[PDB]
PDB file of C-alpha atoms in Angstrom:
ATOM      1  CA  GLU A   9     118.068  78.259 102.931  1.00  0.00           C
ATOM      2  CA  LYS A  10     118.687  81.883 101.950  1.00  0.00           C
ATOM      3  CA  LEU A  11     121.536  82.340 104.438  1.00  0.00           C
ATOM      4  CA  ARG A  12     123.416  79.268 103.210  1.00  0.00           C
ATOM      5  CA  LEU A  13     123.083  80.344  99.577  1.00  0.00           C
ATOM      6  CA  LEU A  14     124.325  83.826 100.476  1.00  0.00           C
ATOM      7  CA  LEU A  15     127.316  82.358 102.328  1.00  0.00           C
ATOM      8  CA  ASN A  16     128.012  80.387  99.159  1.00  0.00           C
ATOM      9  CA  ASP A  17     127.742  83.623  97.165  1.00  0.00           C
ATOM     10  CA  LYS A  18     129.964  85.454  99.673  1.00  0.00           C
ATOM     11  CA  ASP A  19     132.467  83.150 101.313  1.00  0.00           C
ATOM     12  CA  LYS A  20     132.052  81.763 104.808  1.00  0.00           C
ATOM     13  CA  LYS A  21     133.834  82.194 108.153  1.00  0.00           C
ATOM     14  CA  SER A  22     134.649  85.890 107.625  1.00  0.00           C
ATOM     15  CA  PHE A  23     131.388  87.563 108.676  1.00  0.00           C
ATOM     16  CA  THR A  24     129.083  86.439 111.461  1.00  0.00           C
ATOM     17  CA  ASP A  25     125.536  85.523 110.521  1.00  0.00           C
ATOM     18  CA  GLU A  26     123.994  88.679 112.024  1.00  0.00           C
ATOM     19  CA  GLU A  27     125.194  90.934 109.212  1.00  0.00           C
ATOM     20  CA  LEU A  28     124.143  88.204 106.776  1.00  0.00           C
ATOM     21  CA  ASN A  29     120.592  88.520 108.115  1.00  0.00           C
ATOM     22  CA  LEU A  30     120.960  92.292 107.813  1.00  0.00           C
ATOM     23  CA  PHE A  31     121.982  92.027 104.154  1.00  0.00           C
ATOM     24  CA  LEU A  32     119.107  89.645 103.432  1.00  0.00           C
ATOM     25  CA  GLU A  33     116.602  92.024 105.038  1.00  0.00           C
ATOM     26  CA  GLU A  34     117.947  95.123 103.289  1.00  0.00           C
ATOM     27  CA  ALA A  35     117.252  93.543  99.874  1.00  0.00           C
ATOM     28  CA  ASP A  36     114.831  90.734  99.060  1.00  0.00           C
ATOM     29  CA  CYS A  37     116.791  89.810  95.928  1.00  0.00           C
ATOM     30  CA  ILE A  38     119.618  87.596  97.151  1.00  0.00           C
ATOM     31  CA  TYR A  39     122.055  88.776  94.474  1.00  0.00           C
ATOM     32  CA  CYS A  40     121.657  92.409  95.551  1.00  0.00           C
ATOM     33  CA  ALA A  41     122.578  91.414  99.100  1.00  0.00           C
ATOM     34  CA  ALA A  42     125.458  89.399  97.646  1.00  0.00           C
ATOM     35  CA  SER A  43     126.769  92.476  95.827  1.00  0.00           C
ATOM     36  CA  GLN A  44     126.480  94.564  98.999  1.00  0.00           C
ATOM     37  CA  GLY A  45     128.256  91.886 101.017  1.00  0.00           C
ATOM     38  CA  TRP A  46     130.954  91.573  98.372  1.00  0.00           C
ATOM     39  CA  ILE A  47     131.691  95.298  98.542  1.00  0.00           C
ATOM     40  CA  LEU A  48     131.760  95.172 102.345  1.00  0.00           C
ATOM     41  CA  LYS A  49     134.046  92.123 102.155  1.00  0.00           C
ATOM     42  CA  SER A  50     136.279  93.988  99.705  1.00  0.00           C
ATOM     43  CA  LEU A  51     136.684  96.623 102.408  1.00  0.00           C
ATOM     44  CA  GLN A  52     138.285  93.992 104.670  1.00  0.00           C
ATOM     45  CA  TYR A  53     141.349  93.339 102.484  1.00  0.00           C
ATOM     46  CA  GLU A  54     143.160  96.266 104.120  1.00  0.00           C
ATOM     47  CA  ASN A  55     143.373  94.134 107.299  1.00  0.00           C
ATOM     48  CA  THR A  56     143.476  90.521 106.095  1.00  0.00           C
ATOM     49  CA  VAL A  57     146.177  91.062 103.435  1.00  0.00           C
ATOM     50  CA  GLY A  58     147.420  94.580 104.103  1.00  0.00           C
ATOM     51  CA  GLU A  59     149.635  96.713 101.907  1.00  0.00           C
ATOM     52  CA  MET A  60     152.802  94.592 102.262  1.00  0.00           C
ATOM     53  CA  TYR A  61     152.265  92.723  99.019  1.00  0.00           C
ATOM     54  CA  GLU A  62     155.810  91.303  98.786  1.00  0.00           C
ATOM     55  CA  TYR A  63     158.592  90.581 101.263  1.00  0.00           C
ATOM     56  CA  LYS A  64     161.804  88.561 101.507  1.00  0.00           C
ATOM     57  CA  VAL A  65     163.210  87.311 104.819  1.00  0.00           C
ATOM     58  CA  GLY A  66     166.260  85.065 104.885  1.00  0.00           C
ATOM     59  CA  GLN A  67     165.792  82.754 101.914  1.00  0.00           C
ATOM     60  CA  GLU A  68     161.977  83.064 102.046  1.00  0.00           C
ATOM     61  CA  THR A  69     160.356  85.220  99.365  1.00  0.00           C
ATOM     62  CA  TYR A  70     156.586  85.629  99.042  1.00  0.00           C
ATOM     63  CA  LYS A  71     154.702  87.761  96.509  1.00  0.00           C
ATOM     64  CA  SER A  72     151.033  88.121  97.406  1.00  0.00           C
ATOM     65  CA  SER A  73     148.464  89.753  95.163  1.00  0.00           C
ATOM     66  CA  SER A  74     148.418  93.509  95.661  1.00  0.00           C
ATOM     67  CA  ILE A  75     145.484  95.002  97.545  1.00  0.00           C
ATOM     68  CA  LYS A  76     144.403  96.943  94.451  1.00  0.00           C
ATOM     69  CA  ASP A  77     143.978  93.731  92.459  1.00  0.00           C
ATOM     70  CA  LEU A  78     142.032  92.056  95.270  1.00  0.00           C
ATOM     71  CA  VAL A  79     139.620  94.958  95.741  1.00  0.00           C
ATOM     72  CA  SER A  80     139.256  95.210  91.959  1.00  0.00           C
ATOM     73  CA  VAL A  81     138.270  91.541  91.738  1.00  0.00           C
ATOM     74  CA  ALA A  82     135.840  91.918  94.640  1.00  0.00           C
ATOM     75  CA  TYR A  83     134.292  94.942  92.923  1.00  0.00           C
ATOM     76  CA  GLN A  84     134.005  92.947  89.706  1.00  0.00           C
ATOM     77  CA  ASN A  85     132.201  90.164  91.583  1.00  0.00           C
ATOM     78  CA  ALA A  86     129.862  92.709  93.173  1.00  0.00           C
ATOM     79  CA  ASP A  87     129.176  94.195  89.739  1.00  0.00           C
ATOM     80  CA  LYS A  88     128.407  90.741  88.340  1.00  0.00           C
ATOM     81  CA  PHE A  89     125.919  90.068  91.127  1.00  0.00           C
ATOM     82  CA  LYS A  90     124.360  93.515  90.642  1.00  0.00           C
ATOM     83  CA  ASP A  91     123.939  92.888  86.914  1.00  0.00           C
ATOM     84  CA  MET A  92     122.398  89.533  87.804  1.00  0.00           C
ATOM     85  CA  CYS A  93     119.951  91.299  90.120  1.00  0.00           C
ATOM     86  CA  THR A  94     119.013  93.707  87.334  1.00  0.00           C
ATOM     87  CA  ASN A  95     118.580  91.020  84.665  1.00  0.00           C
ATOM     88  CA  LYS A  96     116.494  88.850  86.992  1.00  0.00           C
ATOM     89  CA  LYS A  97     114.273  91.869  87.724  1.00  0.00           C
ATOM     90  CA  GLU A  98     114.462  93.264  84.170  1.00  0.00           C
ATOM     91  CA  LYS A  99     111.503  93.135  81.783  1.00  0.00           C
ATOM     92  CA  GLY A 100     111.482  93.579  78.027  1.00  0.00           C
ATOM     93  CA  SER A 101     109.849  96.365  76.070  1.00  0.00           C
ATOM     94  CA  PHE A 102     106.083  96.839  75.884  1.00  0.00           C
ATOM     95  CA  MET A 103     103.522  98.267  73.479  1.00  0.00           C
ATOM     96  CA  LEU A 104     100.162  98.835  75.163  1.00  0.00           C
ATOM     97  CA  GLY A 105      96.803 100.281  74.252  1.00  0.00           C
ATOM     98  CA  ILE A 106      95.815 103.813  75.226  1.00  0.00           C
ATOM     99  CA  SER A 107      92.312 105.268  75.393  1.00  0.00           C
ATOM    100  CA  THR A 108      90.595 108.427  76.633  1.00  0.00           C
ATOM    101  CA  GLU A 109      86.886 108.762  77.331  1.00  0.00           C
ATOM    102  CA  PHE A 110      84.957 111.069  75.026  1.00  0.00           C
ATOM    103  CA  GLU A 111      81.363 112.019  74.249  1.00  0.00           C
TER     104      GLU A 111
ATOM    105  CA  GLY B 168      42.251 112.319  89.733  1.00  0.00           C
ATOM    106  CA  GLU B 169      45.512 110.683  90.859  1.00  0.00           C
ATOM    107  CA  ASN B 170      45.303 106.997  89.912  1.00  0.00           C
ATOM    108  CA  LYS B 171      47.770 105.359  87.526  1.00  0.00           C
ATOM    109  CA  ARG B 172      46.171 103.263  84.780  1.00  0.00           C
ATOM    110  CA  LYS B 173      47.863 100.527  82.736  1.00  0.00           C
ATOM    111  CA  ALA B 174      46.143  98.791  79.824  1.00  0.00           C
ATOM    112  CA  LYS B 175      47.539  96.454  77.144  1.00  0.00           C
ATOM    113  CA  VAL B 176      44.853  96.835  74.467  1.00  0.00           C
ATOM    114  CA  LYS B 177      45.186  94.876  71.232  1.00  0.00           C
ATOM    115  CA  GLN B 178      42.639  94.920  68.435  1.00  0.00           C
ATOM    116  CA  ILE B 179      42.044  93.080  65.156  1.00  0.00           C
ATOM    117  CA  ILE B 180      40.579  95.287  62.416  1.00  0.00           C
ATOM    118  CA  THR B 181      38.965  93.596  59.410  1.00  0.00           C
ATOM    119  CA  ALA B 182      36.708  94.595  56.539  1.00  0.00           C
ATOM    120  CA  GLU B 183      33.681  92.905  58.117  1.00  0.00           C
ATOM    121  CA  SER B 184      34.193  94.004  61.723  1.00  0.00           C
ATOM    122  CA  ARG B 185      36.588  95.314  64.364  1.00  0.00           C
ATOM    123  CA  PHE B 186      37.603  93.363  67.480  1.00  0.00           C
ATOM    124  CA  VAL B 187      39.195  94.969  70.553  1.00  0.00           C
ATOM    125  CA  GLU B 188      40.150  93.491  73.922  1.00  0.00           C
ATOM    126  CA  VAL B 189      41.981  95.114  76.835  1.00  0.00           C
ATOM    127  CA  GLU B 190      44.148  93.423  79.480  1.00  0.00           C
ATOM    128  CA  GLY B 191      44.281  95.815  82.417  1.00  0.00           C
ATOM    129  CA  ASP B 192      42.369  98.815  83.689  1.00  0.00           C
ATOM    130  CA  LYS B 193      39.093  99.769  82.039  1.00  0.00           C
ATOM    131  CA  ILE B 194      39.305 102.411  79.301  1.00  0.00           C
ATOM    132  CA  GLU B 195      36.009 104.264  78.991  1.00  0.00           C
ATOM    133  CA  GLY B 196      36.194 104.934  75.249  1.00  0.00           C
ATOM    134  CA  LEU B 197      36.715 101.335  74.093  1.00  0.00           C
ATOM    135  CA  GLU B 198      33.950  98.719  74.031  1.00  0.00           C
ATOM    136  CA  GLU B 199      35.522  95.273  74.250  1.00  0.00           C
ATOM    137  CA  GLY B 200      34.494  92.517  71.871  1.00  0.00           C
ATOM    138  CA  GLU B 201      33.627  92.574  68.206  1.00  0.00           C
ATOM    139  CA  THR B 202      31.952  95.655  66.728  1.00  0.00           C
ATOM    140  CA  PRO B 203      30.603  95.646  63.152  1.00  0.00           C
ATOM    141  CA  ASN B 204      32.283  97.581  60.356  1.00  0.00           C
ATOM    142  CA  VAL B 205      29.907 100.141  58.846  1.00  0.00           C
ATOM    143  CA  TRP B 206      31.666  99.632  55.487  1.00  0.00           C
ATOM    144  CA  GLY B 207      33.046  96.420  54.037  1.00  0.00           C
ATOM    145  CA  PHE B 208      36.644  97.574  53.684  1.00  0.00           C
ATOM    146  CA  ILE B 209      39.453  97.992  56.192  1.00  0.00           C
ATOM    147  CA  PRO B 210      39.684 101.709  57.149  1.00  0.00           C
ATOM    148  CA  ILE B 211      43.507 101.548  57.490  1.00  0.00           C
ATOM    149  CA  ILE B 212      45.840 102.639  54.677  1.00  0.00           C
ATOM    150  CA  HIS B 213      49.479 101.528  54.472  1.00  0.00           C
ATOM    151  CA  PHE B 214      52.048 103.999  53.130  1.00  0.00           C
ATOM    152  CA  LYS B 215      54.944 101.855  51.900  1.00  0.00           C
ATOM    153  CA  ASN B 216      58.142 103.831  51.358  1.00  0.00           C
ATOM    154  CA  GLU B 217      60.289 102.353  48.584  1.00  0.00           C
ATOM    155  CA  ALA B 218      57.870  99.479  48.101  1.00  0.00           C
ATOM    156  CA  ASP B 219      59.257  96.344  46.465  1.00  0.00           C
ATOM    157  CA  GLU B 220      57.648  93.288  44.914  1.00  0.00           C
ATOM    158  CA  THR B 221      59.734  91.016  47.188  1.00  0.00           C
ATOM    159  CA  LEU B 222      59.068  92.885  50.477  1.00  0.00           C
ATOM    160  CA  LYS B 223      55.982  92.831  52.680  1.00  0.00           C
ATOM    161  CA  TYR B 224      56.761  96.224  54.263  1.00  0.00           C
ATOM    162  CA  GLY B 225      58.495  99.372  53.124  1.00  0.00           C
ATOM    163  CA  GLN B 226      62.069 100.383  53.815  1.00  0.00           C
ATOM    164  CA  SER B 227      63.546 103.586  55.195  1.00  0.00           C
ATOM    165  CA  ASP B 228      65.801 105.928  53.249  1.00  0.00           C
ATOM    166  CA  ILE B 229      68.250 105.635  56.163  1.00  0.00           C
ATOM    167  CA  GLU B 230      68.899 101.942  55.431  1.00  0.00           C
ATOM    168  CA  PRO B 231      71.124 102.403  52.327  1.00  0.00           C
ATOM    169  CA  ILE B 232      73.202 105.095  54.069  1.00  0.00           C
ATOM    170  CA  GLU B 233      73.278 103.540  57.558  1.00  0.00           C
ATOM    171  CA  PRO B 234      76.568 101.574  57.266  1.00  0.00           C
ATOM    172  CA  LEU B 235      78.180 104.677  55.790  1.00  0.00           C
ATOM    173  CA  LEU B 236      76.882 106.572  58.822  1.00  0.00           C
ATOM    174  CA  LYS B 237      78.463 103.941  61.075  1.00  0.00           C
ATOM    175  CA  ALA B 238      81.813 104.220  59.293  1.00  0.00           C
ATOM    176  CA  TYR B 239      81.636 108.022  59.373  1.00  0.00           C
ATOM    177  CA  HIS B 240      80.894 107.925  63.104  1.00  0.00           C
ATOM    178  CA  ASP B 241      83.787 105.542  63.737  1.00  0.00           C
ATOM    179  CA  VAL B 242      86.247 107.652  61.744  1.00  0.00           C
ATOM    180  CA  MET B 243      85.136 110.907  63.366  1.00  0.00           C
ATOM    181  CA  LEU B 244      85.212 109.447  66.882  1.00  0.00           C
ATOM    182  CA  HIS B 245      88.653 107.902  66.414  1.00  0.00           C
ATOM    183  CA  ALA B 246      89.901 111.197  64.976  1.00  0.00           C
ATOM    184  CA  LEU B 247      88.490 113.115  67.945  1.00  0.00           C
ATOM    185  CA  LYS B 248      90.076 110.724  70.440  1.00  0.00           C
ATOM    186  CA  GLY B 249      93.432 110.901  68.672  1.00  0.00           C
ATOM    187  CA  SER B 250      93.312 114.694  68.586  1.00  0.00           C
TER     188      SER B 250
END
């Protein structure tokens, strides 16, 4: 199933399946839709993680990955899927015959 | 008048006599069947160009040059197309 494979490519339980169908329709190649979804999922780190990358309260101290690193990794994943889409659709060089009619 | 006339006439000429038969419309000038030869030799003469002891017929002066003509045509045509 295309939707299940896309959810594997772009993790589950964050987006509802409607936008997954939208991404599938906007590009037949699944990896292109995966790259698009990965960028759009990268946009969501400003809410899920936020800017507060480190805090200490009482004796608790937690250092989360900064938002810049997370969006960078998401962009890298999107780039990998885009390169996959290109290579799957890429074709090598060609030398072909040419001919013009003449009397 | 207007009519179209087809006729496949073939004839065998020999020293003794001439034979002609026609398959199709009647041709007024030709009498079918054998007709005697007024002289005892065949009135046809064969002009054999470049006659040879090993050939029944002659041979055209175009034959020796013909493959060169083909090569010349090919080279000129390919040159024209490339240009």
